[PDB]
Amino acid sequence: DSVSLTLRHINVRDTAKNTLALLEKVVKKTEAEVPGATFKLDGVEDTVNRDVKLKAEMAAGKPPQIFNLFGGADTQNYAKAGHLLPLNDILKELGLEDKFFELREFTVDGKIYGLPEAGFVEGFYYNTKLFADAGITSAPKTWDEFTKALEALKAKNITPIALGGGSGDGWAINMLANSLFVATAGPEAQEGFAKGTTKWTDPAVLDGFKRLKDLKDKGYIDPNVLGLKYSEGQAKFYTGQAAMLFDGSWATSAILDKDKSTVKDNVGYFRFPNIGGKGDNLINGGWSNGYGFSSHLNDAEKKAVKAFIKNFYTLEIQGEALGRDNRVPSMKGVPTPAEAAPLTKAIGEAQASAKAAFPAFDALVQPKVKVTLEQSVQELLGGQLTPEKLVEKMQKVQDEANAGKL
């Protein structure tokens, strides 16, 4: 039987034309395989869709059948209102329930209400030529290999780690801290902060901040860290003046910039190295944008939605977006097409080989906690706050935030 579905998407600018062509290819395949089902693509600017169009359709109880959806508050509100299709059974039928890095941003009371299309990871960009100058012939696999790479770089008077964390950019220090204390304490520590089951003051979390301070005190983190903006820290790396940079994968376009980058012919990438505890082989990431589906569906619409999901959420489709546009997969194990750029392949392998991902701590704690950590790590690197006093300050605001509801 005939069924028409509107597919609200955000791939409207010319820079998104290959992602749109990817979507259209998936649609055509789905329409061949489910005769009678047709998809009317409705491209709308991302912020217009989020803040205006989808929001009003949801208030009216009439979303399109398929729509670009953000995780977090948006998905929480629309699921609560009953307008999002629960996806648990479809994922199980398609064998997809364990194939994504992280669905928590689309999960409400155990039920999955959306599927991220792409996201970000964090890791070390590094300069292969500066590494070779210091005798480092491969990326550090482990923390001990990481510290001796740092020692070798310092001995050659090469700034080891670029970082711009001054003024209002404490969040950039928190990227590195984030992953250091997940490496020292494991991912479960930060999951429990907002629940009261774990604490910022736990010794393995404290250890991460002690290691962070030691990187700064030994000159491995750029001594000028607190006098540099985030973008200037990126600049320190990509103009060739630091051996590595911990940053999110959104920074690839800056690292490969046609006008500003001098390292784009000799840049590599590696995950945060293994310390040997509960955080080995994990990669930090976030996946907050993808497709949600209307709950207000007849049987024909439910069949076409499942068929679209089956054809869209595949390793091949994920891999095409990665290779062409440096769109970081939401799905695990995605291979990079051989035609991709070397840095794209480097990030893809670091992500694809990861055992699992963990969220940014700020996806797990209250805004006030996030703001406090940003100020605190600046004072930590600045020698004005000890690691012990940082974690007590953090748990004090964490306790107050948790009492905010309960």
Residue numbers in the entry: 47 to 452
Could you share sentences copied from the article?
The crystal structures of NagB2 in ligand-free or complex forms with (GlcNAc)2 (NagB2/(GlcNAc)2) and (GlcNAc)3 (NagB2/(GlcNAc)3) were determined at 1.2 to 1.8 Å resolution. There were two polypeptide chains in the asymmetric unit of the crystal of the ligand-free form (chain A, Asp47–Leu452 and chain B, Val49–Gly450), whereas there was only one polypeptide chain in the ligand-bound form. In contrast, in the asymmetric unit of the ligand-free crystal of NagB2, the two polypeptide chains showed two different opening structures. The inter-domain rotation angle between the two chains was 27.1° and belonged to an open form (chain A) and a semi-closed form (chain B). When (GlcNAc)2 was bound, this angle changed to 56.8° between the closed and open forms and 30.2° between the closed and semi-closed forms. When (GlcNAc)3 was bound, the angles were 58.6° between the closed and open forms and 32.1° between the closed and semi-closed forms. Upon binding to the ligand, SBP undergoes a conformational change from an open conformation to a closed conformation. This change is known as the “Venus flytrap” mechanism. The structure of NagB2 also changed significantly upon ligand binding, and the rotation angle was comparable to that of previously known structures.
In conclusion, we identified and characterized Paenibacillus spp. NagB1 and NagB2 proteins as SBPs for chitin oligosaccharides. Binding experiments of the recombinant NagB1 and NagB2 to several oligosaccharides using differential scanning fluorimetry and surface plasmon resonance confirmed that both proteins are SBPs of (GlcNAc)2 and (GlcNAc)3. SBPs, a component of ABC transporters, are responsible for trapping ligands that are imported through a specific pathway formed by two TMDs, and mainly define the specificity and affinity of transporters. The structures of NagB1 and NagB2 were classified as subcluster D-I and contained two α/β domains connected by a hinge region consisting of three strands, with the substrate-binding pocket located between the two domains.
